[PDB]
Design a binder for this molecule. Sequence first.
Ligand SMILES: O=C(NCc1ccc(S(=O)(=O)c2cc(F)cc(F)c2)cc1)c1ccc2cccn2c1
Ligand SMILES: O=C(NCc1ccc(S(=O)(=O)c2cc(F)cc(F)c2)cc1)c1ccc2cccn2c1
Lengths: 469, 471
Amino acid sequence: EFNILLATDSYKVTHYKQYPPNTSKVYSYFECREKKYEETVFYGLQYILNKYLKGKVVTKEKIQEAKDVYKEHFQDDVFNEKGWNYILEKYDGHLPIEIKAVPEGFVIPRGNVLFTVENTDPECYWLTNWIETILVQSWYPITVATNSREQKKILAKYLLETSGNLDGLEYKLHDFGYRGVSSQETAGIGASAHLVNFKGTDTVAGLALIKKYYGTKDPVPGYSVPAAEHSTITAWGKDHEKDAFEHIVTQFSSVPVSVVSDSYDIYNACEKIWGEDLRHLIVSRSTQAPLIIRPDSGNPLDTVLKVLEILGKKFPVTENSKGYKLLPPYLRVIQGDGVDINTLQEIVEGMKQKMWSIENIAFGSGGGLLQKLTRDLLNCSFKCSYVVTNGLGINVFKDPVADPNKRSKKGRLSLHRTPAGNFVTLEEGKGDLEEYGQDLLHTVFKNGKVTKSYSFDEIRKNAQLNIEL
Amino acid sequence: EFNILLATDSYKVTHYKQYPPNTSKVYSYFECREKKKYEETVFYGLQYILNKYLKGKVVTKEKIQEAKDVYKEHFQDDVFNEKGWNYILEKYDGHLPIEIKAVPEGFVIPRGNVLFTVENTDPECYWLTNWIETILVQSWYPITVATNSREQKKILAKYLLETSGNLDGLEYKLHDFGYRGVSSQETAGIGASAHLVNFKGTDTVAGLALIKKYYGTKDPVPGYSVPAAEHSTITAWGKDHEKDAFEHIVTQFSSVPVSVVSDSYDIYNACEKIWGEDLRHLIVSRSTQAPLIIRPDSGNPLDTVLKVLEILGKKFPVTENSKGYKLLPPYLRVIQGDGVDINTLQEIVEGMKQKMWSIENIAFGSGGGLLQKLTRDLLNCSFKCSYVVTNGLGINVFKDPVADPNKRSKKGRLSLHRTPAGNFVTLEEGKGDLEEYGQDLLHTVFKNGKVTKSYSFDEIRKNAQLNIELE
Ligand SMILES: O=C(NCc1ccc(S(=O)(=O)c2cc(F)cc(F)c2)cc1)c1ccc2cccn2c1
Ligand SMILES: O=C(NCc1ccc(S(=O)(=O)c2cc(F)cc(F)c2)cc1)c1ccc2cccn2c1
């Protein structure tokens, strides 16, 4: 079972003897540090608060376990048993902590305070940065949600240009990354973050997380349709790729179905099998049940363009009102190999130059969507900005001589609307001057309790694109 | 609770209706696929997955009904295979009728070889082999972390041996700083454990409990750390009192090793003026078993390391070792824990060597670079079907995309063998039955719900040793 006394960086175990004597208060903040990605979606803290921080997180057994572990780990007795016992005895194991945060789903420019942390008991000054490590893992849902949102922007732009509307946008980037993430837990968290912007997912773990920690009006937040894999085609034998195709589209004849077509020869499969041998089973399909062809190898733009040209000559293509070419409603394409934000952009622009509508295509992304991301992408960072020692409050910060981008903020922080309606972070307690209206941060955690929360439906609303609004 | 019926890619829910009719067996393998450098991989992590997620009664009435409900909404259709899952529940008390054979954990195997194989042991459960692809393929992560950590150990070994003449302290030259930099708690524990196959130094505590629980060690714990400051414990003293903070911290830890981040305002001033003059007397008194380890944390990693050494070299009595390289006094060392990945690690040690500085002087800390900046396509970790039995006839199967020969998969029943020259080969098409190549190196690790062979973390470490260590 999870033990919060064992969920921090090792060295922080030793930090309580390192602060100045008579320190009563430690106050720290989290930001996506300013240096693409000018704005970030704040999402994920509510999960961490509820799964890891709330309630009785400290027991005698957990204290003893950590004591035993750290003695061997440090080859010495440095663990703060006394501090942790004080929490157990005074607050029934509830963390004397207050956390303030911007609403989840909010889109905020880099360089702004997103949440703040401080101790509510003078004895528990060391506690603020104990929980840095667990809290800083919010970088991941923030970064997935943000990067996913950036991709939706690109998809909106081109769909709008080639089609004149945004129908189907929310199904244009599907989550394929379940097998490509580092763990089950990462799968659920990451899948949940993508669903801030889209509705298509194959990462089932995300559904349960949302249900448990956020909630939706609808039964589920994410959806999928039947589809083949290489094993359901190749199992028929190299000489029976037509038989496999036919069985599969017949099994799923009244619902949408995606069929990977590159097991042996994508171009042959599209031109001869789909476009000639099995054409009669495709053109009979309902507009609500298209066949979605899936190429899965070769240069991503080159293959997409060639697949489209092949189908364009085997099937009746129309020209939409924008002058762009459109496959018939029963036939679509999904590119789910080598898709990340850069290649996605390359494909839609290449499609546009060849006069293909973005209506024709959908994308699947795996590692690119959920795994190929790090904390330094948005520079998610947690730092101390204010301490009270000997009854005096001190504005504190780092400011390394060789890197000004690592300079941290000073003093008590607050977030505000500017007269132009933008965000500004005020430092040095300056928000108390009331020259910038009310602090936009809300108290979301205090003394073991989650004090403010948001539904997944509201998070989605907050994270909408300007074009959508 | 965890529900294995909900732990796959959505589309695989639909696959039981797509395999050829009269198919009684589906057989699939996992490889770190060769690409037209990472030429060898450490096999590690399967045993965790087996125990945590696959063994025992993983199917219940409730889990079947839960999945049925979720999938009806998720698909807006009744595609779920309630009968197949019911059969497992009734026939086998919820245990998976599956057999997995794998190379021993810790084994170091060239790219393009079979690492494990999965097949159903009951004809009705042909669909079950690839249902569990997704969960099994997540072994890419500990494999890749253990592999990438090993490759960094190789570099450290090369330069430490050249500049110092031995390998003393190699196992503590790359420390795990990535707890806050990984995507989740679970990832943290798994990732930290993979690193510990190669080193002993970690701050990612989550890893120790995993190892104790799923592998176990002779010693009380597999990984270690020592006292150190962070920016908060320095800055809290106030800008004008960096010296007060330094002095207080080395005094608290006067008898144990201690690392102090020195770049809060000016790293060069800190080393030369603060450590090098004001507080010099607190450093030169320290024991060899309790050095001060100065930690820079910004600027160009190589440039800053060189400058810090150059500074310290002139304020402290440096010796020249027997290989001709410069060595700080035993009470003074350096740790670089910013911007460190396999690429910059190499650039730093080579630059140090060029400037006649021993690798004895330095240790590295790696966070995101060690545990997060890795993907499945780094080693091309991949799971594919190679053999099926249809109408009682076995057939060898594979993909072979025209546009990408690198994605071609293997054919038929597989086995892994020693070559006459002591290397590795994977035999395809059931050829291992000919017995021209000694015994299959794969062993049954999982069968019908039970874990059938386990490895201690000690064994794993022994298997993963560097050649230079053996020599
Ligand atoms: O095809 C897959 N999943 C089913 C699927 C089919 C079609 C789409 S789609 O984006 O074309 C689509 C989604 C949707 F929600 C409704 C639709 F009508 C079409 C999305 C997923 C699929 C293929 C490969 C793969 C690798 C890892 C996970 N993976 C999932
Ligand atoms: O300094 C840190 N941790 C303590 C530490 C001190 C010294 C070393 S070392 O590699 O120099 C060393 C390790 C060891 F196990 C024994 C030693 F004597 C020295 C390693 C970690 C430290 C610094 C930054 C950071 C960020 C995230 C996690 N982080 C941990």
